[PDB]
Amino acid sequence: MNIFEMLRIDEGLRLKIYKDTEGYYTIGIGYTSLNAAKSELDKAIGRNTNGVITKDEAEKLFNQDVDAAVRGILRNAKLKPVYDSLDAVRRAALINMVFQMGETGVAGFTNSLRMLQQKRWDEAAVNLAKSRWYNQTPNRAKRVITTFRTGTWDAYK
């Protein structure tokens, strides 16, 4: 088990485009005007695909984003610190975080972070949990949260 498998348990998977509730249209794995959408897939993958891609192209994308989540962590002065003090399992749940909402958005949880360095696990499991984040996605919110609190992937098996 690795971060990748994680987000794949977390983002479903689409071979065709999907408009969703806010107007976001997503494809492949955790990926973000329907024409403006199949006018970026055209640029992302490398071609015209009418909204459809293969699992390869879907995942190549995955790979793209993920590596990005990584970097957005280190370009940040607020995250890299908390990162370095986290272990593999805890660090990845952070990566599952940035992936989802991005560095800046996570950059908002200062309390929750200071709590994640002192290793106040529990407190950071209850702070993160009372959020617009959590309320909208309690299923994955909870998984990545358990992860932050235990130091194990028993939220993924």
Side-chain angles (χ1 to χ4, degrees):
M1 183 64 124
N2 70 45
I3 164 64
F4 289 93
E5 273 140 48
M6 172 196 270
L7 298 156
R8 166 83 187 73
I9 307 284
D10 281 26
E11 304 287 29
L13 174 45
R14 297 183 200 287
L15 316 172
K16 208 196 187 84
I17 291 194
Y18 238 81
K19 80 300 181 167
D20 191 356
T21 303
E22 203 2 15
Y24 349 158
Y25 329 65
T26 66
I27 332 81
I29 312 201
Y31 192 102
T32 308
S33 194
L34 170 61
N35 300 320
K38 57 185 168 149
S39 200
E40 271 273 344
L41 211 85
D42 281 349
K43 63 124 57 193
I45 288 320
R47 66 199 187 70
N48 194 46
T49 192
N50 250 61
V52 188
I53 49 178
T54 70
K55 68 86 166 320
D56 266 49
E57 299 167 322
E59 294 195 301
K60 175 162 157 170
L61 292 158
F62 198 54
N63 215 41
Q64 298 204 73
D65 307 316
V66 185
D67 242 320
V70 170
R71 220 141 36 232
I73 286 173
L74 292 70
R75 274 174 177 157
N76 183 287
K78 213 155 298 171
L79 294 173
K80 180 180 154 64
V82 188
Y83 179 82
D84 319 319
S85 47
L86 295 163
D87 72 40
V89 158
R90 298 195 169 77
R91 356 226 156 67
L94 183 83
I95 278 82
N96 158 187
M97 284 199 97
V98 175
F99 184 108
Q100 175 163 33
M101 300 164 281
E103 36 99 357
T104 338
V106 191
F109 303 21
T110 37
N111 232 315
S112 290
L113 298 164
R114 141 217 156 183
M115 275 185 251
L116 264 173
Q117 272 220 195
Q118 289 259 139
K119 317 203 185 334
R120 283 161 180 288
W121 300 153
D122 272 284
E123 283 163 281
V126 90
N127 211 20
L128 289 170
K130 52 189 161 55
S131 81
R132 162 256 212 288
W133 177 46
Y134 184 97
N135 337 99
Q136 196 79 203
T137 169
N139 252 31
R140 149 190 188 166
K142 276 183 191 144
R143 292 185 276 283
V144 47
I145 285 192
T146 272
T147 323
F148 269 132
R149 187 184 53 64
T150 56
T152 94
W153 317 90
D154 276 285
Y156 289 73
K157 29 167 281 309

